[PDB]
């Protein structure tokens, strides 16, 4: 399922940071996902 | 009495005959509203933030969105008409009936349609959101066929691409091009032989869905000087015109219109040198309507 | 009383093989009557539609216009025919009357082809402009590029300069105005095998574009393309000698006559009829067929076409 | 009782001639019955005419020397094969299909094909065997190669078709049965499954450029009454290559009741030997100028 947007809150998490650590945030990339639970 | 009578078949003719040289009636909107001289819209937009707490209080919120209300409304007129010369008038009239129906008829969507059209382009030339796109450096190079399927389609990708991130669904939407590039010449898209049921056309003159859209068309497209559509300017700031320009991209619920009275047509005898006369009108017409986004193509 | 009847099918069969086959009975106007030998219907050259305040009442334009519509009528009568024997026709009854059909169906429309194209070429020998209204004509025809034609017979060779030809045909139309949606450009049978290659190289492909159930093309600047008869004009009138010779309008060096809807008109007298008839002095029976009546008549404008030099 | 069991085949062999049968259709034919011979018009598809309320039309009548040109059998066509009746039980069934098979299909087997074949011959003489492709087949091999210029052929078919003013919008290529890959091959190097090409439904592929097209093995009895021919003078022969066409009602021929058929003893060798029969034979009509193509 593709998304639309991919900002909101909580974003909450250094979205914004290029870096600073936390090599999961946000616009570094698309690869997030999940599953059921 | 009976020779006015005949003018409520002509007048179901016509109507019915507005149809099948239609070209937009649906994929754009339209209202019934009575006396209105103008009508008017919402603008808006699509955005969300952070939530309530039962403290403080919800009314700050909305300072940055800029709610926008929009309205047009009618222009002169719209319509032609035609001069009889009829004894046959009255009957015989299966033939001829059919021949000046057709005349005015296609006619009036012939001017309906640039009106609702080049005005588009017009709400990506200004500086809606925005949009454009093409293939490399000309047309001049690029001609053969089935290349003329290619790079077009392969514009289409992209073209669905910007109809995502400013939103709008993908539900249901048009494009409009110009009957030469017409169907990516349907080479490049069909490069199989005897099935349009596989390309699902059940009449209504529409191929059936492409990635993105749909695609069909009527000829060209002008009206406006019969606004800005300048065909004949290259660039001047603004490349959305014609000569350039490229088969159309309609967005989501970007334009449509209000109209009074529906169509009425009036019948009449001016003698001055003369037979006879009909008149029928339509009273709307419009450009408009702040568009979500839009755009087109280009060569260069 | 079957005698007769053998008759009664007969017409039907021709009327219906004959609609299934033609370049015509679309791509024109048809009107209709009854007993009227003769006929009138109005022209194209001035309309639209627009929009005013209520400032200023038109027809300032349309008073400046020549003619509004002119009549026509009835050119003799029309049939083609042949002499049968009657016993081996009456039995034999899907077989003999399938070769009957067809034998019939094929002269209506030679015959239909041969008079829309004549009256199309015939068009043009007047020389009515260079006189009043600038715009009001009109007419004429021809671009002609080729460097004579006479250098180059390959399939790029030719038909490609034609397809830089009536690139020029769009720009004529809307010069004399008119609408410009239907337009067709009949043409010969052949030398648009060049232009099919002139379009898409290779790739066979041939079906998807031209279209299945019509032997046409969807267009080329818009445009319907017909491969007919005719290679020669229709002078079978359409003059068939002269190089130039006043009319530049031609023959041999003839290709091109492209036109539109509402240049042409015709009539009938009825749908049809027939009649069989006994002369001793050629034995056995000979069939006439009542149709086709005054297919002469021109409204234009428009009308041009394109040949070599 | 005996025959009843023949009185079901027969119909297997009616049946029988259905199919690898190639024409029920595509050629005109004619129902007499009684009779040897029959006829049939051709009309010059020519003329005219609208007229002036005077004239006699009388040169037209002249002219054409049309008259319906009349045909009529050639000896008797049939063959059929020799058995012994262990087989002819009606119980174990399967019988009834191998035999009726070699009889039905082996019926329709030659008269097909001559009826094809002196089409070749329509022009030995001195209204088309026009084409040449590029040199030989030697030199194109591999199939899409040899595609091209096949459908490129067709083309000028459809050429020569017209001028003559005869359509012929009807037709379908009578063609080798192998190297008629080339059709579909530069058609699809893509596919697969040829299966649905939408509609070679029933034993008929759908619109080529123009025309219509089948195709199909024999054809070896392109063959002329003059086949074997190498070039001599007509290189209308077989292996100049493939290339055979025509149109609507170039010939026919004619029946007579029907094939019906009966069998006997013959004490030569034996249990019992059947036989059917049939009237047909050429087909018909005229130089509606078809032929073939080729290449050198």
Not at chain 2, 104 to 129: K, P, Q, R, W, Y
Not at chain 2, 255 to 283: C, S
């Amino acid at each position: 399922v593709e998304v639309p947007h991919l900002t909101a809150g909580g974003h909450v998490f250094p979205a914004n940071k290029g870096e600073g650590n936390v090599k999961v945030a946000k616009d570094n990339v698309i690869g997030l996902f999940m599953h059921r639970s | 009495d009976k020779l006015a009578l005949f003018l409520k078949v002509f007048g179901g003719e016509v109507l019915t005959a507005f149809a099948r040289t239609s070209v937009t009636t649906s994929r754009h909107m339209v209202r019934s509203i009575s006396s209105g001289k103008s009508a008017q819209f919402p603008v808006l937009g699509r955005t969300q933030a952070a939530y309530l707490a039962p403290g403080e209080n919800l009314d700050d919120k909305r300072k940055d969105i800029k709610h926008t209300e929009k309205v047009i409304t009618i222009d002169g007129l719209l319509t032609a008409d035609v001069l009889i010369y009829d004894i046959e008038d009255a009957m015989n009239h299966y033939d001829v009936r059919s021949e000046y129906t057709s005349q005015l008829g296609e006619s009036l969507a012939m001017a309906a349609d640039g009106a609702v059209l080049a005005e588009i382009a017009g709400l990506c030339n200004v500086e809606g959101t925005a949009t454009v796109i093409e293939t490399t450096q000309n047309k001049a190079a690029l001609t053969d066929q089935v290349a003329l399927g290619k790079e077009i389609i392969a514009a289409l990708t992209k073209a669905r691409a910007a109809l995502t991130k400013n939103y709008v669904p993908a539900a249901d939407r048009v494009f409009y091009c110009d009957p030469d590039s017409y169907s990516a010449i349907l080479a490049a898209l069909m490069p199989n032989a005897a099935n349009y049921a596989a390309l699902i056309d059940p009449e209504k003159g529409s191929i059936r869905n492409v990635m993105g859209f749909e695609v069909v068309e009527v000829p060209h497209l002008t009206a406006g000087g019969a606004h800005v559509f300048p065909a004949n300017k290259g660039e001047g700031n603004v490349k959305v015109a014609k000569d350039n320009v490229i088969g159309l991209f309609m967005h989501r619920s970007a334009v449509g219109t209000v109209k009074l009275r529906d169509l009425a047509l009036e019948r009449a005898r001016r003698a001055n040198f003369q037979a006879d006369q009909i008149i029928a009108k339509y009273a709307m017409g419009h450009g408009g309507l702040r568009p979500e986004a839009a755009g087109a193509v280009v060569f260069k």
